[PDB]
């Protein structure tokens, strides 16, 4: 059986700027157990039918996990753009797999704000599919060299989220797991 418990019931999730990737292999995968689970608010599949997942079998399966705002959930899809889609986590336009997300306000939000989750605001260019840029260098936005502490046309490219229990839904944290399927290593029952 595949270690889905270690992905969906994980103690902690990574920031979207530095999303975790776990490669799943040599196991039996139960998909309908998730599809029909009341624990999820969003379950959207691309290239595959969610009702046939138990019969389908694949090669490598990658589970990419991270935390974003509810309002940013719409960006986790092929053909979409935005700060997350372009500078944090880019999906290929021919992406094959399913995007699963749920409200984690009662799990991650803290009084005063949980600032352990970051995303990029700035980068020299847009990300390639599944590119994970975790550098901490200062971004320069002009002809002026930085050579030190951020300031004019020099920025620390990351920003934290003020995730709080008093936030509106769009500003509440959501746990997102993207299941990317290549196409016999991972196979359903």
């Amino acid at each position, epitope marked *: 059986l595949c270690p889905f418990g270690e992905v969906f019931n994980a103690t902690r999730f990574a920031s979207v700027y530095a999303w975790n990737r776990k490669r799943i292999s040599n196991c039996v995968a139960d998909y309908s157990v998730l599809y029909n689970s009341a624990s999820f608010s969003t379950f959207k599949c691309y290239g595959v039918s969610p009702t046939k997942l138990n019969d389908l079998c694949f090669t490598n399966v990658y589970a990419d996990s991270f935390v974003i705002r509810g309002d940013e959930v719409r960006q986790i899809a092929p053909g979409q753009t935005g700060k997350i889609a372009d500078y944090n986590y880019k999906l290929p336009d021919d992406f094959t797999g399913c995007v699963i997300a749920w409200n984690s306000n009662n799990l991650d939000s803290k009084v*005063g*704000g949980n*600032y352990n989750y*970051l995303y990029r*605001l*700035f980068r020299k260019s847009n990300l390639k599919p599944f590119e994970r840029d975790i550098s*901490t260098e200062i971004y320069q*936005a002009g002809s*002026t060299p930085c*050579n*030190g*502490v*951020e*300031g*004019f046309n020099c*920025y*620390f490219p*990351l*920003q*934290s989220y003020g995730f709080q229990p008093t936030n509106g839904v769009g500003y509440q944290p959501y746990r997102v797991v993207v299941l990317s399927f290549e196409l016999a290593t991972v196979c359903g029952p």
Partner: antibody
Amino acid sequence: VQLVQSGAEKVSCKASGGPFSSSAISWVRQAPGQGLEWMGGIIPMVGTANYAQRVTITADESTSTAYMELSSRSEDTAVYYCARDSRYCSGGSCYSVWFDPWGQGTLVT
Amino acid sequence: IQLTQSPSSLRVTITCRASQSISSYLNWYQQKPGKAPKVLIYAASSLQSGVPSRFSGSGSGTDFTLTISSDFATYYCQQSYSTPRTFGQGTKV
């Protein structure tokens, strides 16, 4: 979001609430009768401190605490403050940086 | 980039001039005796939440002004435009 500094005499600054590794923590010196001087600061996520153009500036995310080590003159007698580097930022172009919180201050003689 | 502010001692206004253009990267602080400084104005003219409407300011490039419509403390201007970061001399109300 408060900053707590060590008492009068290493000089520590513990963060309680708010962001830590995502925001540079700087040290500012204020000798009696004088103005403010920025001496440097560090982003815990980077691990590298930058210095004003003698003093060791470091931080450790695991305890949400910043440190400054002073060693070997009488002319350096001053109150030392820690402060967090915050910014008001808009889309496209980010145009400001300032020091928002600020600890009680450490008296070093 | 050094800052020069005046008058050194004092509705009142305090001005701070940059030796070089610094866009809108200056700020203003209020420091009471024996206490840490607090933020008044950032990004040249934007008020910090909690700051009374009695406080305002504006300017661009080199010439900036802090205005108090009606708090006896020392006020400072700050330069975060470029390294090294610096501060003004301080004006006493």
